[PDB]
Design a protein around this ligand. Structure first.
Ligand SMILES: Nc1nc2c(ncn2[C@@H]2O[C@H](COP(=O)(O)OP(=O)(O)O)[C@@H](O)[C@H]2O)c(=O)[nH]1
Lengths: 416, 26
């Protein structure tokens, strides 16, 4: 059975905790501490005890509750409402295959609903499952469901999703969470647990375009130039032509050649796979043409470069900078094997680290603990990819004065 | 019917907000 990770999103009070609880309760996957507490067993009491565990400091990320369906192992890896929510998503400590977006039937789509959807697209979460919750509070009415569904469809289509399920539920009474409802004959689609069972396996790194961040470069007498690095995505074959960026951009000519040979642990290979630490001999490339922090790809889909005349947009969490960060801040960005100075050109939004809600557009400054959406200009060219496309090259750290200031993920690149 | 105009205005405002989000995350 494939393993799959999910996150719950949606506006505060719309019923994320209650839906998780209902999933746990109806599958009998009650947390052990709660089973012990018990040693009457109604749903309401269990919700009280899940809430109490939360207040004792057990957060969903830490609890990482799991259940089984006929075709999946499912881990609930995170949800808004706890100190390190945004940090876990940005760093990649929590990686989700799917997001369950909970929208209350009583309120509809709210501004924070839309914000979490954007956070989901940004992270590269390809699979959305919408629940329209609290159906019991609107008399199980189809028209209400249909009116909220249309709001949801409009939002998620604008974002680029398509053919996600929209399931009317009552986390509180149980309808369509695990057990098919008998109150909504007008709905014929999956239950939430059925929709979870059908989350597709994640795209494999081998199927993404080739990226190999270069760690070091050798020039061996009578063999030639041998870069060393890790295959992050795609696959490398003897015979392949590879191009190096930002080498090619900096030199205004293609720094590229044919792979004469590959080696891992000083033993020959005919092909290298994701995770392999390799040396490779490239013909027609001079030792001086490439260096640590270059990245190799096929000429087909060369590694994306942000030039000094470009900018990129990132979401960050500020880890350690107690004084104000303002426009013009110029620390050092570390990503894969590169390090380059970067300038903060704009701070577009301040973001709530607990929830991923926007706190403020165009704030003047940010500090330790803030999350933010920022536009950065590299002072030397750098290979970066949007995390939603090639996550292995979409995360970075910001360093200044010996310490780690922030961690970030790349949202987009602005060609200048 | 002032109420209808106000609902539309508020609806459009929310669409403008969506567009601000598209720009922010674009
Ligand atoms: N009647 C009803 N109440 C619900 C439902 N889902 C959640 N609630 C209640 O609404 C409040 C917020 O739910 P909660 O799961 O805490 O929302 P969260 O903040 O999104 O996790 C709680 O008091 C729940 O008991 C539902 O389907 N029907």
């Amino acid at each position: 059975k494939p393993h799959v990770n999910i996150v719950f999103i949606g506006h505060v009070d719309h019923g994320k905790s209650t839906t998780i609880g209902r999933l746990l309760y109806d599958t009998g996957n009650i947390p052990e501490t709660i089973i012990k507490k018990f040693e009457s067993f109604k749903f309401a009491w269990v919700m009280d005890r899940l809430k109490e565990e939360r207040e004792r400091g057990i957060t969903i990320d830490v609890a990482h509750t799991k259940f089984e369906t006929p075709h999946r192992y499912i881990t609930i890896i995170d949800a808004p409402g706890h100190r390190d929510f945004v940090k876990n998503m940005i760093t990649g400590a929590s990686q989700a295959d799917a997001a369950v977006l909970v929208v209350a039937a009583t309120d509809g789509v709210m501004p924070q609903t839309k914000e979490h959807a954007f956070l989901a697209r940004t992270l590269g979460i390809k699979h959305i499952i919408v629940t329209i919750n609290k159906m019991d509070m609107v008399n199980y009415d189809q028209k209400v469901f249909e009116k909220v569904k249309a709001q949801v469809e409009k939002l998620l289509k604008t974002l680029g999703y398509k053919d996600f399920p929209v399931i009317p539920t009552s986390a509180w009474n149980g309808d369509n969470v695990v057990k098919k409802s008998d109150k909504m004959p007008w709905y014929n689609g999956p239950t939430l647990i059925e929709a979870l069972d059908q989350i597709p396996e994640p795209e494999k790194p081998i199927d993404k375009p080739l990226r190999i961040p270069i760690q070091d470069v050798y020039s061996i007498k009578g063999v030639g130039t041998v870069p060393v690095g890790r295959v992050e995505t795609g696959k490398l074959k003897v015979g392949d032509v590879v191009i190096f960026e930002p080498a090619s951009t900096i030199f205004h000519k293609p720094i590229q050649g044919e792979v004469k040979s590959i080696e891992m642990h000083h033993e020959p290979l005919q092909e290298a796979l994701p995770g392999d630490n390799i040396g490779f001999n490239v013909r027609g490339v001079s030792k001086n043409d490439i260096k640590r922090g270059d990245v190799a790809g096929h000429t087909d889909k060369p590694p994306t470069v942000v030039r000094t005349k470009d900018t990129f947009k990132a979401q960050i969490i500020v880890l350690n900078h107690p004084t104000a960060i303002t426009v013009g801040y110029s620390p050092v960005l570390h990503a894969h094997t590169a390090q380059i100075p970067v300038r903060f050109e704009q701070i577009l939004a301040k973001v709530d680290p607990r929830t991923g809600n926007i706190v403020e557009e165009n704030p003047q400054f940010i500090k330790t603990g803030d999350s933010a959406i920022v536009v950065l200009r590299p002072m030397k060219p750098v290979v970066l990819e949007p995390v939603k496309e090639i996550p292995q090259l979409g995360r970075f750290a910001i360093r200044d004065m010996g310490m780690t200031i922030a961690a970030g993920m790349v949202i987009s690149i602005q060609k200048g | 019917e002032k109420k209808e105009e106000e609902e539309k205005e508020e609806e459009v405002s929310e669409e403008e907000a969506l567009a601000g989000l598209s720009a922010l995350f674009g």
